[PDB]
Design an enzyme around this catalytic site. Structure first.
Site, PDB file in Angstrom:
ATOM      1  N   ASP A  29    -121.884 -39.824  69.549  1.00  0.00           N
ATOM      2  CA  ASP A  29    -120.911 -40.425  68.500  1.00  0.00           C
ATOM      3  C   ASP A  29    -121.821 -41.443  67.509  1.00  0.00           C
ATOM      4  O   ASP A  29    -121.750 -41.487  66.326  1.00  0.00           O
ATOM      5  CB  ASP A  29    -119.851 -41.224  68.980  1.00  0.00           C
ATOM      6  CG  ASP A  29    -118.860 -41.765  68.161  1.00  0.00           C
ATOM      7  OD1 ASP A  29    -118.071 -41.099  67.588  1.00  0.00           O
ATOM      8  OD2 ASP A  29    -119.043 -43.067  67.726  1.00  0.00           O
ATOM      9  N   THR A  73    -111.707 -42.168  69.246  1.00  0.00           N
ATOM     10  CA  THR A  73    -112.034 -42.639  70.570  1.00  0.00           C
ATOM     11  C   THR A  73    -110.883 -43.016  71.640  1.00  0.00           C
ATOM     12  O   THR A  73    -110.572 -42.210  72.327  1.00  0.00           O
ATOM     13  CB  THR A  73    -113.307 -43.493  70.658  1.00  0.00           C
ATOM     14  OG1 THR A  73    -114.544 -42.835  69.673  1.00  0.00           O
ATOM     15  CG2 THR A  73    -113.596 -43.828  71.961  1.00  0.00           C
TER      16      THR A  73
HETATM   17  C1  Y9I Z   1    -113.993 -49.248  69.582  1.00  0.00           C
HETATM   18  C2  Y9I Z   1    -114.353 -48.657  70.665  1.00  0.00           C
HETATM   19  C3  Y9I Z   1    -114.362 -47.360  71.097  1.00  0.00           C
HETATM   20  N1  Y9I Z   1    -114.820 -47.048  72.362  1.00  0.00           N
HETATM   21  C4  Y9I Z   1    -115.394 -47.918  73.000  1.00  0.00           C
HETATM   22  N2  Y9I Z   1    -115.906 -47.545  74.064  1.00  0.00           N
HETATM   23  C5  Y9I Z   1    -116.168 -48.343  75.368  1.00  0.00           C
HETATM   24  C6  Y9I Z   1    -116.075 -47.715  76.708  1.00  0.00           C
HETATM   25  C7  Y9I Z   1    -116.610 -48.096  77.899  1.00  0.00           C
HETATM   26  N3  Y9I Z   1    -116.327 -47.072  78.760  1.00  0.00           N
HETATM   27  C8  Y9I Z   1    -115.478 -46.023  78.441  1.00  0.00           C
HETATM   28  N4  Y9I Z   1    -115.441 -45.289  79.568  1.00  0.00           N
HETATM   29  C9  Y9I Z   1    -114.326 -44.112  79.600  1.00  0.00           C
HETATM   30  C10 Y9I Z   1    -112.910 -44.290  79.542  1.00  0.00           C
HETATM   31  C11 Y9I Z   1    -112.576 -43.125  80.188  1.00  0.00           C
HETATM   32  C12 Y9I Z   1    -111.101 -42.451  80.127  1.00  0.00           C
HETATM   33  C13 Y9I Z   1    -110.684 -41.114  80.371  1.00  0.00           C
HETATM   34  C14 Y9I Z   1    -111.828 -40.414  81.185  1.00  0.00           C
HETATM   35 CL1  Y9I Z   1    -111.363 -39.072  81.716  1.00  0.00          CL
HETATM   36  C15 Y9I Z   1    -113.065 -40.760  81.124  1.00  0.00           C
HETATM   37  C16 Y9I Z   1    -113.464 -42.213  80.783  1.00  0.00           C
HETATM   38  C17 Y9I Z   1    -114.645 -43.078  80.843  1.00  0.00           C
HETATM   39  N5  Y9I Z   1    -115.012 -45.740  77.329  1.00  0.00           N
HETATM   40  C18 Y9I Z   1    -115.238 -46.550  76.329  1.00  0.00           C
HETATM   41  C19 Y9I Z   1    -115.077 -46.391  74.867  1.00  0.00           C
HETATM   42  N6  Y9I Z   1    -115.736 -49.119  72.750  1.00  0.00           N
HETATM   43  C20 Y9I Z   1    -115.016 -49.638  71.616  1.00  0.00           C
HETATM   44 CA    CA Z   2    -115.215 -41.072  70.267  1.00  0.00          CA
HETATM   45 ZN    ZN Z   3    -116.983 -42.213  66.340  1.00  0.00          ZN
END
Ligand code: Y9I
Ligand code: CA
Ligand code: ZN
Ligand SMILES: *[C@@H]1O[C@H](CO)[C@@H](O[C@@H]2O[C@H](CO)[C@@H](O[C@@H]3O[C@H](CO[C@H]4O[C@H](CO)[C@@H](O)[C@H](O[C@H]5O[C@H](CO)[C@@H](O)[C@H](O)[C@@H]5O[C@H]5O[C@H](CO)[C@@H](O)[C@H](O)[C@@H]5O)[C@@H]4O)[C@@H](O)[C@H](O[C@H]4O[C@H](CO)[C@@H](O)[C@H](O)[C@@H]4O[C@H]4O[C@H](CO)[C@@H](O)[C@H](O)[C@@H]4O)[C@@H]3O)[C@H](O)[C@H]2NC(C)=O)[C@H](O)[C@H]1NC(C)=O
Ligand code: CA
Ligand code: K
Ligand code: NA
Length: 805
Positions: free
Chosen positions: A261, A159
């Site tokens: 996921d 991720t």
């Molecule tokens: C161990 C682990 C793994 N993963 C997460 N999660 C929390 C979280 C909270 N918010 C987001 N937003 C995503 C970040 C991003 C980056 C590029 C683009 Cl194009 C869109 C976005 C929207 N992603 C995440 C990932 N937590 C803990």
């Molecule tokens: Ca992922």
């Molecule tokens: Zn996963």
């Protein structure tokens, strides 16, 4: 320490994050345990749920409600997303016919179409077809917009590496998020999914899209969402931000879903439990599109629906344990699971030896479900080495498997049926891309592409200049109706010399021999014409490659091939030849087995010598243009020129000779002729970029002949295979590879068998883009086609993957 006694009054989901010890009201305050005391009460209202009902239509505004059905809600920008459907007889967006959006249809005061990125975690590419009956909103975005059959993630297919690649356009080795778990030996610090170290900005390199936007005067919504903020509240927050005054309103937004996921890990990618999460994501998309339609923004915004990676079937019983291979298992630290990274448990252990660990993990069990690599030996297409956070020892794990250190690791921590992280060419790891909006195309299918390309496109969609990144800007112009990026080909830096015959045979003391003393005006004239480039049109189909660095090189013409010969590296940078469908394969005649011939166009001082190869007991030589594919016995002598010779380990020659003798003709048969460009690569510092002379770590013993780390070939033909490669009117078809130049075939566990049982398997693993070869050589290919430059950039980014449907 946070003073949580402050208030979120008029601050809910504020965009500027406030400085400790002041309490926060932004979408991450929960994650830092830093929200003001009243954040839940004011910012996370849930009363009466998420949908208007007939009985609520025209209600007196109650500020306690999660969303509103009162007459004033559209102007306040806080209607439940179904308000106009329930209360004003409107249709859901999903029930409206698809209608081409040729121009942005935006409210007065919008300076540009906003971008909304709808990111879905673990959304495997095949869900678009397999889940289509339960995802009508997503199916409308896909069918009416611009879609790829799949999008290729970066390795490792985890991720954080993939979301930060989406954000930056960088490979993980460059942005520095090389896994979900990392140790940085310079910081002496560990990054984990759970905990606070990951919030330290020192981990995160490059320039993510929200910073690129902010630096160029384009306001961004906050991309990250605390897990406890329900999806409905994330959507309503975005719709509220879109109702801000012109000078305050962001132009770029991100929504994130932890599904599918979260359920995929529990149930497997196609577990029956997976239908409900897909239905729930679709409902969320429908809430966004209905909300945009209510705000008259559904023909204004560009929407991207994009995933980070897919999901494979992985169960606890498919785990390899290092304890079954290593004597010394307590002296290593393993980063485990769908990839392995090994380092010493203690830097004080002077008996730690990577060589003995690699040897103990190499081809030990007949069905062994992982393969060890020193990171520099991983396939170059993974771009997974140039970072101090990437341990020298890597395990590439077979799909459907895990690696762990000892069995107690698996049952002192079965549960899970799904996982991801494997090689980014594995079909189960592929993910999704859909673009919908005025700037995207209508009802358009585009070929699969890599997620490193999307940063550039999101910059194009927002009128931003991208920060330097690993995309090829222009390679995705075919996704866009407008705002295409129209680059110019790079300037050639070094012009070639065109040497004629300038040296007598006796000036050369190379220790070479050849039985070529064999003596006609007709054919004397033809030989001279061939040396002057009379056949060059047949063998150099797309122009000569441009040399984009300062060097000294010569063009050398021959009947059957043309080369760019480096006077600095004493070998060709590139060798170009065309093999028709009708071509005949021949032998190296007995009398020519050891034949090497001085090139009377090239000074003895700028030539290899045979004595070096005789003295070097490890290193042999091969030829770039294969003597097997000579057009005639007389033309074959050209293939033995010292200017066509390259250093090759015997182990490599087994691969190279099979490629040249068997596979090139097989490809010419299958593709109706091929054009081949072959050459060396030097990447001793594993940075993916052309080495300078002073970075070369190995030479042919006693000589200045540098030893390549890899050999490449670019194999091009007509996409319309009814036309021969040398008479192609339209688009091209390419496949390429970057083969590692190794002194053994330890990578190929079946290498004792006939080359027909293992060589092509090796070449498929080391498949490459032409762009990967361009980085590694400082050459620029396909400069003279009659195709659009953007079409050629798309061709240069193509990867031949060798996965079935
Ligand atoms: C161990 C682990 C793994 N993963 C997460 N999660 C929390 C979280 C909270 N918010 C987001 N937003 C995503 C970040 C991003 C980056 C590029 C683009 Cl194009 C869109 C976005 C929207 N992603 C995440 C990932 N937590 C803990
Ligand atoms: Ca992922
Ligand atoms: Zn996963
Ligand atoms: C994919 O796209 C990216 C983006 O275009 C390409 O990466 C670029 O490659 C360039 C060549 O490798 C590299 O240029 C170097 O930049 C140095 C300045 O770096 C800082 O500033 C930039 C700009 O803000 C910043 O981005 C950098 O960020 C990196 O470093 C921090 C950690 O400190 C990380 O947080 C971040 O993740 C990123 O790390 C990545 O790159 C570094 C290298 O910079 C790697 O080590 C990491 O593993 C990781 O991959 C920095 O904050 C600059 O100082 C360098 O100049 C030296 O070297 C050149 C050699 O050509 C020489 O001419 C100069 O004289 C100078 O030499 C002196 O330093 C040497 C080393 O100490 C020393 O030996 C000499 O004797 C001299 O003292 C160099 O210009 C550029 O930084 C990166 N950018 C990024 C974002 O990675 C990448 O190549 C593409 N990949 C492919 C395959 O195409
Ligand atoms: Ca290099
Ligand atoms: K030798
Ligand atoms: Na082997």
């Amino acid at each position: 320490w946070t003073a949580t006694s402050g208030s979120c009054k008029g601050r809910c989901f504020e965009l500027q994050e406030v400085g400790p010890p002041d309490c926060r009201c932004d979408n991450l305050c929960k994650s830092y345990s830093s929200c003001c005391h009243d954040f839940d009460e004011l910012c996370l209202k849930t009363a009466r749920g998420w949908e208007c009902t007939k009985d609520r239509c025209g209600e007196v505004r109650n500020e306690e409600n999660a969303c509103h059905c009162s007459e004033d809600c559209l102007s306040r920008g806080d209607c439940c997303t179904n308000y106009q459907v329930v209360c004003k007889g409107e249709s859901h967006w999903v029930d409206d016919d698809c209608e081409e959006i040729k121009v942005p249809e935006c409210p007065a005061g919008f300076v540009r179409p906003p971008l909304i990125i709808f990111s879905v975690d673990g959304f495997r590419a095949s869900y678009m077809k397999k889940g289509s009956k339960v995802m009508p909103n997503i199916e409308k975005l896909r069918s009416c917009g611009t879609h790829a059959p799949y999008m290729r993630p970066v390795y490792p297919t985890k991720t954080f590496p993939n979301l930060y690649t989406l954000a930056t356009g960088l490979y993980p080795e460059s942005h520095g998020i090389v896994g979900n778990s990392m140790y940085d030996p310079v910081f002496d610090a560990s990054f984990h999914l759970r905990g606070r170290e990951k919030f330290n900005h020192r981990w995160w390199g490059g320039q993510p899209l929200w910073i690129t936007a902010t630096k160029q005067g384009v306001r961004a919504g906050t991309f990250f969402w605390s897990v406890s903020i329900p999806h409905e509240r994330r959507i309503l927050t975005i719709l509220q931000w879109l109702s801000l005054p012109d000078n305050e309103r962001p132009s770029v937004y991100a929504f994130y879903s932890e599904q599918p996921d979260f359920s995929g890990h529990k149930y497997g990618p196609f577990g029956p439990e997976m239908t409900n999460p897909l239905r729930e994501i679709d409902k969320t998309v429908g809430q966004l599109m209905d909300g945009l339609k209510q705000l008259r923004l559904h023909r204004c915004v560009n929407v991207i629906f994009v995933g980070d990676h897919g999901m494979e079937d992985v169960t606890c019983d498919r785990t390899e344990f290092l304890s079954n291979y290593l004597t010394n298992v307590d002296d290593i630290t393993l980063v485990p699971g769908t990839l392995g990274r090994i380092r010493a448990k203690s830097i004080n252990n002077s008996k730690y030896d990577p060589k003995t660990i690699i040897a103990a993990l190499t081809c030990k069990k007949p069905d062994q479900h992982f393969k060890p690599y020193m990171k520099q030996h991983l396939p170059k297409r993974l771009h997974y080495a140039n970072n101090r956070r990437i341990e020298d020892i890597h395990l590439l794990v077979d799909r459907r498997w895990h690696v762990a250190r000892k069995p107690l690791d698996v049952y002192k921590k079965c549960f899970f049926q799904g996982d991801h992280g494997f090689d980014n060419k594995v079909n189960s790891m592929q993910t999704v891309f859909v673009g919908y909006g005025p700037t995207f195309k209508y009802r358009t299918k585009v070929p699969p592409f890599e997620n490193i390309e999307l940063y550039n496109v999101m910059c194009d969609l927002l009128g931003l200049k991208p920060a330097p990144n690993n995309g090829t800007h222009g390679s995705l112009n075919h996704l866009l109706r407008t705002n295409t990026f129209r680059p110019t080909m790079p300037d050639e830096v070094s012009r070639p010399n065109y040497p004629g015959i300038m040296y007598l045979q006796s000036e050369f003391d190379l220790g070479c021999t050849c039985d070529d003393k064999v003596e006609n005006k007709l054919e004397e004239l033809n030989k001279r014409l061939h040396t002057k480039g009379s056949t060059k049109e047949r063998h150099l189909l797309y122009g000569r490659p441009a040399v984009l660095y300062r060097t000294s090189y010569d063009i050398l013409y021959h009947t059957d091939f043309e080369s760019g010969y480096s006077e600095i590296f004493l070998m060709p940078l590139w060798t170009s030849y065309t093999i028709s469908k009708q071509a005949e394969v021949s032998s190296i005649p007995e009398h020519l087995t050891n034949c090497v011939r001085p090139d009377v166009r090239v000074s003895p001082g700028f030539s290899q010598n045979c004595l070096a190869y005789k003295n070097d007991k490890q290193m042999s030589y091969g030829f770039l243009f294969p003597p097997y594919l000579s057009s005639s016995p007389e033309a074959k002598y050209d293939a033995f020129l010292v200017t066509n010779m390259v250093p090759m380990y015997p182990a490599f020659k087994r691969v190279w000779a099979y490629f040249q003798r068997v596979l090139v003709k097989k490809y010419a048969s299958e593709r109706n002729g091929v054009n081949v460009i072959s050459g060396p690569i030097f990447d001793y510092n594993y940075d993916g970029l052309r080495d300078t002379e002073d970075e070369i770590k190995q030479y042919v013993e006693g000589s200045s002949i540098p030893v390549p780390t890899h050999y490449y070939s670019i194999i091009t033909s007509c996409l319309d295979f009814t036309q021969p490669a040398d008479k192609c009117d339209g688009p091209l078809s390419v496949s390429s590879f970057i083969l590692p130049h190794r002194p053994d075939n330890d990578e190929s566990c079946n290498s004792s068998e006939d080359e027909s049982k293992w060589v092509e398997e090796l070449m498929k693993m080391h498949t490459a883009r032409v762009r990967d070869i361009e980085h590694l050589t400082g050459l620029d290919f396909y400069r003279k086609t009659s195709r659009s430059y953007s079409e050629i950039l798309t061709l240069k980014t193509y990867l031949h993957t060798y996965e079935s449907e």
